[PDB]
Write a protein that binds this ligand. Structure first.
Ligand SMILES: Cc1cc2nc3c(=O)[nH]c(=O)nc-3n(C[C@H](O)[C@H](O)[C@H](O)COP(=O)(O)OP(=O)(O)OC[C@H]3O[C@@H](n4cnc5c(N)ncnc54)[C@H](O)[C@@H]3O)c2cc1C
Ligand SMILES: Cc1cc2nc3c(=O)[nH]c(=O)nc-3n(C[C@H](O)[C@H](O)[C@H](O)COP(=O)(O)OP(=O)(O)OC[C@H]3O[C@@H](n4cnc5c(N)ncnc54)[C@H](O)[C@@H]3O)c2cc1C
Ligand SMILES: NC(=O)c1ccc[n+]([C@@H]2O[C@H](COP(=O)([O-])OP(=O)(O)OC[C@H]3O[C@@H](n4cnc5c(N)ncnc54)[C@H](OP(=O)(O)O)[C@@H]3O)[C@@H](O)[C@H]2O)c1
Ligand SMILES: NC(=O)c1ccc[n+]([C@@H]2O[C@H](COP(=O)([O-])OP(=O)(O)OC[C@H]3O[C@@H](n4cnc5c(N)ncnc54)[C@H](OP(=O)(O)O)[C@@H]3O)[C@@H](O)[C@H]2O)c1
Lengths: 481, 481
């Protein structure tokens, strides 16, 4: 039709796909709309979830929290720093949002310059080749040759009285007018863990509420070490607990009634803020996919190895895609690769294996490859070797920081090549450490090259090259301390 | 004789060799003596150069300097931090030395526990199987079956009036009674660069004096970016300059006369402290090597691929070894491997290739593999590809930190497998970033796996996986900023 390609959604995948497609000669349009959060009505510019309400504000709040610790440690080194320091939440919000808005503008200019037609409207299918764009002016537009769906998701709400009325989600949190105060974080995935982490670091009082387990999908030894790490720093956890309701009392305070799911313990407590970090739901609803005859696997769209949907002419990429890693660089690269196969004469497909990730908890946890339990399930316990250790960061000594949760692990093939299957690290700058190892795994990293890679001294990254104690041995993982 | 193995020198290599040899059934002795610095008479416990006067105190001073910046940045994030903070040099020295002495004691206990006979004496050869140990009591002892020389070196002094009298070296610096004040750092190797770096960061006024070039042996594009980095932060450099003398004037101040070597410009300036970081000289002198018939290559001992000297029964390892990387983990691992070949029935030799290193300058520089110029010299310019980029750390935005010297580069084979030859990074936590890539290089890292390794977002480590602009292209290395 009017376009070679229409891209539905202007986030990490959408924009990456749109820009790449134009680079290879295509006439392309990209639609992006941001539906305002129910209650509070929070809204943001173009660029998607990461820039506006995801990786970026998250990392900036984490850094702000990290810098407070740095202030407290500086005194141990001889700096005449004052003990009683406090962050200004409105000042922090201000700085964070200033950076985001600057990025928004640059993104818009970059899109125009690269000749990507950005439409600030909500797209819905009329037909496998025809889309209704709904602009601000209530105006509409139609038609294109190929389609890329990169619509992502939005924070879920519990089906519980008071939830959408009194509670907030990550969407709201990063520009919050009100000071968080005492806050209940419902959800022990990374978003809930990270938020609780930096809320404590900035002088507030979070509680994490767990339905079942901490960080589902992650190595559970590591997930429990991160949780215990957080309790060490004064973050309490409510185990096996589900919320029942929240109500605004004539007080300004928020009463939350909750329930143990193993026991039947009905209990309650009062908070200034309630954060629902209970997962995200794909925005398939507003697309009218049946009009295009595209099949859905419940809030998500199943795609083949080429990101094609059951309709040859229509594709999906990023978060709406069923059961693939939901991260920004995954989305960016899959979108770019896609645009390059459609218009660049490329045959390179996306590689969704051994994607590294970092949980930016107070003590960060990075990993890549298999968890211990998945490797044991997949190959058998007696064909698996785990090398592990507790270690001591050079910079933790003078300030006498806890090394209790500074733990490192390599999950590997036991015999033969001794191929590394997974690497797990809790500690300082965990994503900075794991990134290069994720590349090493991708080049076929074995235990032998790992262990004969010379260390960079003094660093915490060199701890991986120092691994020598196996779990099978039963020897102390704390080595001549 | 009396021992299976005598180890001469109780540093990184010596201790690693001694401990490993006992693990494999050997009767071993290890000698260590620390000659006090001329003037000031500085002395330290067992464990060698790194623990006492090297990597460790260096990293701790660097961290102390880093933590001051963190204090200054915290205000941008909303922390009510006070601007006028100052470190206490004696308090910093105190903390650093407390940690070192604690490590000294633990090291002594560990050696006794592992049954390594530590002799606090100076060893010199009488014979290829016989050593004179000289203890504190003026006492002596003799005799053994095999020998490991791991004696390292000590800071060099210029052959110039006033040098040993008024100037200091890294040996003195880390426990300095007097406050450094305005200090002249002669030497632009890493030790001089690192010291100048943390002296500025802790409120003093260093100058770096360069005889010829900055960081000889390192990639010179990178070496100039680090130097310019330091000037940005207010560290001046005296280019093509050699010192002529230093004299104590009735003033307490130190007058240094110097000279341009390209021009003939005789000039002078007054400093509180003068630091000679002009290299280190191997302690071969005190060994009486001719008595054992061991050949020397001028202050260093040449060894074969098995660390054997021209005398079958005698070995050398660590810093005294001719023309190998002079770093702690190199020394530790070569010493361990050696002990394992002598007593463990191992055939594993040391791998001295692709050893990663970090220069802990204010903005750190890590690298591993070939410099750009060595790769071009070795393979030809047209068989070389350089991928490069300037990047922007997420945490630099709010405090509005300079990104001018945040630069990244991958030196690679141009065609075929596109094997990576070298990786270079200036920026935050450079050793934490490079370590895993050093392992990746060792597993055969190519450009294709590098560039299709998914990034961890947001990090500075992910910048390597984002490399896409080549120098050959001539395109702007600052990509849609
Ligand atoms: C708080 C939080 C922290 C995170 N931290 C990290 C992290 O640190 N590292 C990391 O890698 N990832 C992180 N993520 C995940 C990351 O944000 C996502 O994986 C990524 O943004 C997904 O990109 P996308 O293009 O598929 O979707 P999105 O970025 O969400 O973009 C989709 C866009 O399309 C719009 N849209 C939807 N429907 C329509 C329609 N019908 N018409 C027009 N526009 C439409 C949406 O409103 C949205 O603007 C985080 C996410 C959250 C929420
Ligand atoms: C200031 C500075 C910073 C550094 N920073 C780093 C860095 O961050 N990372 C890194 O990897 N490396 C660093 N190094 C290098 C590192 O310290 C050395 O590579 C390492 O210590 C060498 O180990 P070695 O066992 O060969 O010698 P040493 O550690 O010096 O040990 C030799 C010991 O033997 C003693 N000895 C000498 N002769 C005799 C004798 N005749 N009898 C008995 N004992 C004797 C010596 O006095 C000494 O105690 C740094 C060095 C300096 C000086
Ligand atoms: C993981 O990773 C995948 C995607 O994660 P996601 O985006 O769905 O969530 P997520 O961000 O990874 O985590 C959400 C967290 O909240 C909890 N939770 C979910 N619904 C809840 C409810 N309504 N009431 C109280 N707590 C609730 C989850 O516990 P649970 O472990 O009970 O789900 C989970 O710990 C999932 O398939 C899962 O396997
Ligand atoms: C490098 O790395 C190897 C080992 O380094 P290293 O331990 O010798 O030194 P280093 O620590 O790497 O650096 C010492 C620095 O001081 C300079 N220098 C050396 N002697 C000097 C003198 N007497 N007067 C003024 N400046 C002087 C050197 O400049 P130069 O570049 O002139 O040597 C060098 O920049 C060398 O072989 C070299 O190639």
């Amino acid at each position: 039709y009017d376009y070679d390609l229409i891209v539905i959604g202007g986030g990490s995948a959408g924009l990456a796909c749109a820009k790449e497609a134009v680079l290879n000669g295509a006439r392309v349009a990209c639609l992006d709309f941001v539906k305002p959060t129910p209650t509070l009505g929070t809204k943001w510019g173009v660029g998607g979830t990461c820039v506006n309400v995801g990786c970026i504000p998250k990392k900036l709040m984490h850094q702000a929290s990290l810098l407070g610790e740095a202030v407290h440690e500086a005194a141990a080194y001889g700096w005449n720093v004052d003990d009683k320091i406090k962050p200004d939440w409105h000042k922090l919000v201000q700085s964070v949002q200033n950076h985001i808005k600057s990025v928004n503008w640059v993104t818009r200019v970059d899109l125009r310059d690269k000749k990507v037609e950005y439409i600030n409207g909500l797209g819905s299918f009329v037909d496998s080749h025809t889309l209704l764009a709904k602009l601000k002016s209530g105006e509409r537009t139609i038609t294109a040759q190929t389609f890329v769906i990169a619509v992502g998701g939005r924070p879920r709400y519990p089906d519980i009285p008071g939830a959408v009325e009194y509670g907030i989600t990550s969407d709201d949190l990063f520009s919050l007018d009100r000071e968080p105060g005492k806050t209940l974080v419902v959800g022990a995935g990374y978003i809930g863990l990270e938020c609780a982490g930096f809320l404590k670091g900035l002088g507030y009082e979070p509680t994490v509420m767990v339905r079942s387990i901490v960080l589902r999908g992650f190595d559970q030894q590591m997930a429990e070490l991160v949780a215990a790490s957080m309790e060490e720093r004064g973050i309490p956890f409510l185990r096996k607990t589900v919320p029942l309701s929240v109500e605004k009392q004539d007080d300004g305070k928020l009463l939350v009634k909750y329930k143990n799911v193993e026991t039947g313990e009905e209990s309650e407590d009062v908070y200034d803020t309630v954060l629902w970090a209970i997962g995200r739901k794909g925005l398939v609803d507003d697309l009218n996919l049946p009009n295009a005859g595209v099949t859905v696997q419940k809030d998500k769209i199943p795609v083949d190895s080429q990101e094609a949907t059951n309709v040859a002419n229509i594709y999906a990429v990023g978060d709406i895609i069923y059961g693939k890693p939901e991260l920004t660089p995954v989305a960016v690269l899959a979108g770019r690769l896609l645009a390059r196969r459609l218009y660049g004469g490329s045959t390179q497909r996306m590689d969704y294996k051994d994607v590294a990730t970092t949980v930016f908890t107070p003590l960060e946890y990075a990993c890549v490859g298999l968890s211990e339990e998945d490797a044991v399930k997949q190959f058998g316990a007696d064909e698996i070797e785990v090398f592990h250790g507790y270690y001591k960061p050079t910079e933790f000594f003078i300030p006498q920081k806890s090394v209790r949760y500074c733990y490192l692990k390599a999950v590997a093939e036991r015999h033969g090549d001794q191929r590394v299957y997974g690497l797990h690290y809790i500690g300082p700058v965990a994503g900075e450490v794991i990134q290069g190892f994720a590349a090493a795994l991708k080049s076929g990293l074995t235990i032998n090259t790992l262990i004969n890679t010379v260390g960079i001294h003094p660093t915490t990254a060199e701890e991986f090259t120092r691994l020598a104690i196996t779990k099978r041995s039963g020897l102390d993982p704390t080595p001549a301390s």
